Amino acid sequence: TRTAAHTHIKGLGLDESGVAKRVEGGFVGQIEAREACGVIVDLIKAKKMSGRAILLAGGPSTGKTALALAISQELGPKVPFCPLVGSELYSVEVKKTETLMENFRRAIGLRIKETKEVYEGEVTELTPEDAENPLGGYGKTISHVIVGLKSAKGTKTLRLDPTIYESIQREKVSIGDVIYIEANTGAVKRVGRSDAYATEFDLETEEYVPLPKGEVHKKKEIVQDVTLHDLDVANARPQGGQDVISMMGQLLKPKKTEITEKLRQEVNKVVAKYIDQGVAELIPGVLFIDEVNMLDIEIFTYLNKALESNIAPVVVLASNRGMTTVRGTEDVISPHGVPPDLIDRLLIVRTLPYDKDEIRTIIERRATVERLQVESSALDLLATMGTETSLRYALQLLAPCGILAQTSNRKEIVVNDVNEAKLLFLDAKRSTKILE
Amino acid sequence: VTRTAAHTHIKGLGLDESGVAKRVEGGFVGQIEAREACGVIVDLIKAKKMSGRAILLAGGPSTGKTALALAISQELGPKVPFCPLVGSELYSVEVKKTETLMENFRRAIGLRIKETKEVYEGEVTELTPEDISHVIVGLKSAKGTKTLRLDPTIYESIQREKVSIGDVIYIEANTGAVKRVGRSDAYATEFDLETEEYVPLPKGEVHKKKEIVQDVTLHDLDVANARPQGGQDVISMMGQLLKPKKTEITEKLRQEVNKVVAKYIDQGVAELIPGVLFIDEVNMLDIEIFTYLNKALESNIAPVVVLASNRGMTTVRGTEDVISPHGVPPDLIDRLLIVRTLPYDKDEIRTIIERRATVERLQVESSALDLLATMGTETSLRYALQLLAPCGILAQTSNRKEIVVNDVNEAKLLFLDAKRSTKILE
Amino acid sequence: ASDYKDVERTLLKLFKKNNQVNRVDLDFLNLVFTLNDKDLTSYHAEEI
Amino acid sequence: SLSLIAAHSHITGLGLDENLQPRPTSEGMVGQLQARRAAGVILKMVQNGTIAGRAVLVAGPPSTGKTALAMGVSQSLGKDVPFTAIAGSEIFSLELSKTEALTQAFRKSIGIKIKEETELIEGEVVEIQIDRSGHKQGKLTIKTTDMETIYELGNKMIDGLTKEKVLAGDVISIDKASGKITKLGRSFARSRDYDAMGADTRFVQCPEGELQKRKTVVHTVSLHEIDVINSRTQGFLALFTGDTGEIRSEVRDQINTKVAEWKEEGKAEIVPGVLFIDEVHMLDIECFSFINRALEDEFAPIVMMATNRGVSKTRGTNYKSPHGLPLDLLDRSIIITTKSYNEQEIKTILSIRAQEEEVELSSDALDLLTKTGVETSLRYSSNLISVAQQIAMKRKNNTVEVEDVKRAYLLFLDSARSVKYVQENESQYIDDQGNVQISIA
Amino acid sequence: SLSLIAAHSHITGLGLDENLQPRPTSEGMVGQLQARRAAGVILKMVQNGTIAGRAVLVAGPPSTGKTALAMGVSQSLGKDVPFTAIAGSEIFSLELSKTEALTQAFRKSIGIKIKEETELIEGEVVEIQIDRSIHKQGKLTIKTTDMETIYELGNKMIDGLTKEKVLAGDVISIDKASGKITKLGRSVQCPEGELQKRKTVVHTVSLHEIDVINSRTQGFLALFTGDTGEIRSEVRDQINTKVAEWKEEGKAEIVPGVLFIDEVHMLDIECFSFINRALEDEFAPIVMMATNRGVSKTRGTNYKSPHGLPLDLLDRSIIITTKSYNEQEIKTILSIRAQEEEVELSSDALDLLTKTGVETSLRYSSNLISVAQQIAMKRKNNTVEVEDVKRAYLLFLDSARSVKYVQENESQYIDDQGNVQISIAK
């Protein structure tokens, strides 16, 4: 399997009482940061508060993205988690404010359940009937239709509306075709021809399908997780309609448009109504904005306003610079590149740099997860190299060492392999020196 | 009778078989070394071997860069594609500058193909539908008669063309196009007063087949494969009125078009005619355009692009601290061969003025021509060149054919130069 | 672009199998309501 | 309304008495007595509906109740009174000009209450008998729960009945003005007749009362909505999509004339509202110059403006301004100032916040939180409250205490301590020049 | 893929042995021993596929084969594996956001192979009976190399064969599942075995292609037109989860590839900010970056940077540095280039070309080779002699000589302030 930068991170590694073990879940060190992340994860799982914001502040290569992905893993696949980077907000189709609003709503999941009844099987009979009296109806005066379906557990004779007969005619269903009728909406689908009649003709283009399993009429309760933005898109760009105008619109590209506040208000009303009935439940997720330094002043101000909404995920921010002028502004030097008013709404989680032992343990774990064996002396050399230039350099240099060792048909990486890798690939400081 | 422009007198390079350039041939005067270099470049292009070669015509203003480009275009001939440009054209608003540049690149590469055209032409005798259903139509021609079965699209075209029985129709099989050429002559006396236009019954057989040769470019194929471009069906109308603006053609479409062209060449039905792309005012190009032009020159299928520039040690547009020999970053400069073009002395200026007067059908007295030449030497050659037409107009107003000194002096007193205007402003 | 039609059909067939099974009809539950303005009347809706 | 615990979920409105006198604590607001009096005056001005085009500026430091005061006004106003809340950065669009965005926002803040009179006949058709040769003639009977009547049908009515394909037992509605026939639904008695039902079928009860009824309905539609509807042929979709474009000015003038005509005839009423612009300093000089005239229209709403910047440089200009706004706009604006809270007010605010979040604070923890708020920030303590609650919950303890607050203070930093650490560790963070020492040893 | 001769056509590989030790001159590549070693290590890492999101920078003087190295890597990687080489000036588009473009670029280099087993009958053809309703009765016979047997058709097969109007005695391919019918020419060719064969066809697509395919009603047109638009992020998430499920099922395999940005010095700080995160995630390809400038101000920033890239990216990348070629390496590279261009240079001519390339630029001499060949062609000579190279040097200029010419006569060129001395006199 592919080995990403944060593959070794398997979890936050916390105890039941909240204490974090020294080495668990792929983490090494960062005790206080891990405890703060555990408190935040508890807050997210509580699912009560809206618009809370925290900021993961620290230098480059400290673990901000590592903590974000660890939080995502710990939350589970039932909690929304929208990763992002600051640069993606600058759209060319709609204002950056609209894109921030869209992404911000994506992290409010809704779990809605619906029970559906479907009639499926193989058609055995189809005997349309007219009204008992010619004066009963208009024109064709077609009454109910009788259809016979066959399943693995038996057969059933159904009495259908003339609208369902019209659907049957539209779908071009003949005797022996496997069909599928939804009593919820009256929609008829033509699955295909039964495998029983597969060899009826020795050359024919027909999608033969097996006989449906189970009963002919099976009732199932369907549960799906849908975002609020999904409902907004469905209202904005519905897929319904079979007119020529509908088809022409379908061929058009799905350009983003500034969905009005009225549509969100109506969506909120209907979702509140359905949650009130108990059918559906709201799940506020988490929105992750990496490289918050790159946001414009307008985006920061809209973030200020978004946090005052009634429905709002917990935005987690990452910044790797201090005392830096805010983009889009000439004079405002700010603590982390974040405007002072937004900083006043944030909670800073300080992350601290590592020592040699932590680097050594991280290199051990990274080599282990890489399916590479490293000698103790070569590992000490790699640790010294990382503490000399950067940890990330060594963490990436593990792979070329492994490749070089394989080219020599050696099971483990030797110090000479590390030296040769050093010769082949330089670092930023060495490149700057050699360019001088 | 005829109109005259800046380069109406430029007919060619005037180079011999050995490649050396005579002092005065093809309307050119002097600049022998540049003409020889341009002839070598013409041979390089005609070889049809290399791709992406680029050269730079470096010199001062009014020195003969555009003249050399147009002479190369004339000498190569109308068969090859020569595309002149200013960099300002690249700054489109519908698509990015890269898309325009790449489109101009593939537009400068020519393709010549052989195609067989199947032609039917008849007067109509029956109209039966096979029942949107196929139609059955009978046709006659001077040599005989035929009945045809046409696809529903052709049926829609015929219905929307207001074809009657007894109308004469033209069907091109390749495109499925139906054109009503008119009403048959046999019904000329059918009425006394109607809006009909009567045409004679077509000669020969109903079905004809001919082989033409048509010239296309890679861009034409790209546009053909990208968007619908013709047709008489409402489906075609809707397809082409949708997505009207230009789009960023992908590299995949270009690769597929290249594969198709390679297949055609291998089958022998097509031949390739590499051409030239000329960009003028290259200093107008931003650093991004030069940066991508670096990539296009390494492309395996590119024309012989020539560059003209006339600025020295000027900063590169877009950049703020890059001082370059001609506004061209050093990355592109290494991809170029620089052809130096030199200013003109007094005698060559006089000869050029004489030839321009001869071309524009003017008669100039020797003393008047000497005065015009010396005043062009004093201020500028182009100033003398544009003064020729007002001088000719002035001479006609005096009921006199040949130009005299008085007309030249009057023209100088009436119209001023840039330097004189700048002095007046001061 | 004709040569890519088989690939397009293959991808659509692969995605339809998962797409059709585990989806909830948002239109059925009145979550989509922008078409309702075309064929319904306010007083008719309130009376119904 | 669909809501989660938010920042301003505890402010039910302005805590004013009958004489617009603020209470020491009421409806979730503490202090800001002068500001609350001004807000009540603004509310009475809005409710009166006679004064047109008034700009109000709310100024003061951040976390001083500007947005809180606006939220209180919004809650006090209630429904039927438009309240458009927009940001300064919302007006910048790639589709609409800034002036067009402001124009659409302004019209959204004015609502039009229009009355429609409808005459209908609704009932379950009992029997239909149609005779056709010449023109056709027929008789029809419609019954309700307490009425039954036989009617004679004209040719066009019969044509409509046939084109609707109405059968017996169906409840239908006919507008005697136009004759349009709508099938409401089917009776319950016919439900058994089928196993699967089409999408069109509906089961409804038989209407009660008299067969012929008169009913009038009042509709609340904003001016922007009317303009969008009356611009194109499908504007009502753009009312949700937002791809409405720049409506023609002649359309807007015609719509103003039409609204005036309706008001003169007495069938339409105007319900003016309040426009709130958050962070007005994010607007440009062109927007302000437009607003100067636009505030002066007869249909201009009452605009409230909230700012936190002091003497700063106006966007789109090369000079500094008292609040970032041009003097011409301030001339037509009255400024409401706010003052920072004292210790007792911060204590009351923290108690209110604890009550709203259903967190059981202790007295000692409340004192510690108030001290931290006065030392560092009120919003910092408000954010720390929930963290302390979670920390206490993890300790299997149902009440918060001093240790939980201390742990929250240690785990989560504030602005001052973050500044202290960033200044102490300048070498490990990227600077303006981009230099950073990633190495540690 | 037929195309003319470019400046990189000779590079047929990276020239590695079994022990990854590069030979002095193989597959077109000369020297650059450490650079080729590092390129081979990267190539093996890509082929292994167990490492994702690695960025490699190529460093050192311009015109030192950084693009030549990347091309060698692409060719040595072979087909059946994505390798996207895009210029940094192609990222900035007026229809696609820079982040969206970078995302598409990353996904385009990740390939997915999905196997589709189709039942198709391939046969030579024998007479076909179609009859009216007695819905329809029809029989066809197919001949192969060892069978001749009758199939009895159904309604849809009869309809398809009527639509195709298949003749007899030719060759036809019919798919049992899809139902597509492919025509083939007359029997040169002949069926080779059983009438109905079971052969799987493998389809190579990228994640971007799948995203576009599911993007719209007919989104597969966008793969060629390029008007995809900003795809919704939920669509990409769906593609990711379905691809993960397919890989778990074993019905599709992933082929990670290489992304090459040739001119990284044009992306702004926002692009670098996105790139920093794009590398970390799974399904991220390996990015190759080339830069020539030592220390410059990054676009979008007001400060210098150690390579034109922010230090955050430099921490995430490994840098491969290239030494400038020596005289011997220049000589042998020119020998390879001349051999590729079909030019027969003399020994003294080769030495002169070597010294000329060493003095000014290798590219300059490489472009001068074709000019010299064309010059010799004017003299009707096969071998290129010294005088041809000297004439090529004289007629076409390098950067330094042109700079000297402009510097000594800066008055006749337009300067940075817009001043020029057009007047030849005074």
Ligand SMILES: Nc1ncnc2c1ncn2[C@@H]1O[C@H](COP(=O)(O)OP(=O)(O)O)[C@@H](O)[C@H]1O
């Ligand atoms: N506490 C930790 N334990 C183990 N490995 C870690 C820890 N923190 C970071 N890492 C590893 O080192 C890398 C640096 O963290 P990262 O979030 O990428 O830094 P940045 O602040 O630049 O985003 C991570 O990708 C991860 O692989």
Ligand SMILES: Nc1ncnc2c1ncn2[C@@H]1O[C@H](COP(=O)(O)OP(=O)(O)O)[C@@H](O)[C@H]1O
């Ligand atoms: N050597 C020449 N012989 C004849 N006419 C010339 C010559 N050079 C320039 N001209 C005339 O004067 C004009 C100016 O030349 P041009 O090519 O525009 O100069 P540049 O392109 O260097 O600015 C040309 O259009 C042409 O009509």
Ligand SMILES: Nc1ncnc2c1ncn2[C@@H]1O[C@H](COP(=O)(O)OP(=O)(O)O)[C@@H](O)[C@H]1O
């Ligand atoms: N008058 C008030 N009454 C109660 N709480 C207030 C008041 N003003 C501010 N707050 C508190 O501060 C926050 C609202 O302040 P806000 O209006 O955003 O400040 P500003 O807008 O002045 O920056 C809420 O958390 C609220 O508890």
Ligand SMILES: Nc1ncnc2c1ncn2[C@@H]1O[C@H](COP(=O)(O)OP(=O)(O)O)[C@@H](O)[C@H]1O
């Ligand atoms: N080691 C080499 N062997 C053969 N040809 C080379 C070598 N290095 C560079 N070249 C050729 O020299 C020219 C310059 O190389 P290029 O990659 O464009 O330089 P850069 O990428 O540094 O600008 C190209 O024509 C290339 O094919």
Ligand SMILES: [Mg+2]
């Ligand atoms: Mg990082």
Ligand SMILES: [Mg+2]
């Ligand atoms: Mg010119």
Ligand SMILES: [Mg+2]
């Ligand atoms: Mg506020």
Ligand SMILES: [Mg+2]
């Ligand atoms: Mg290079």
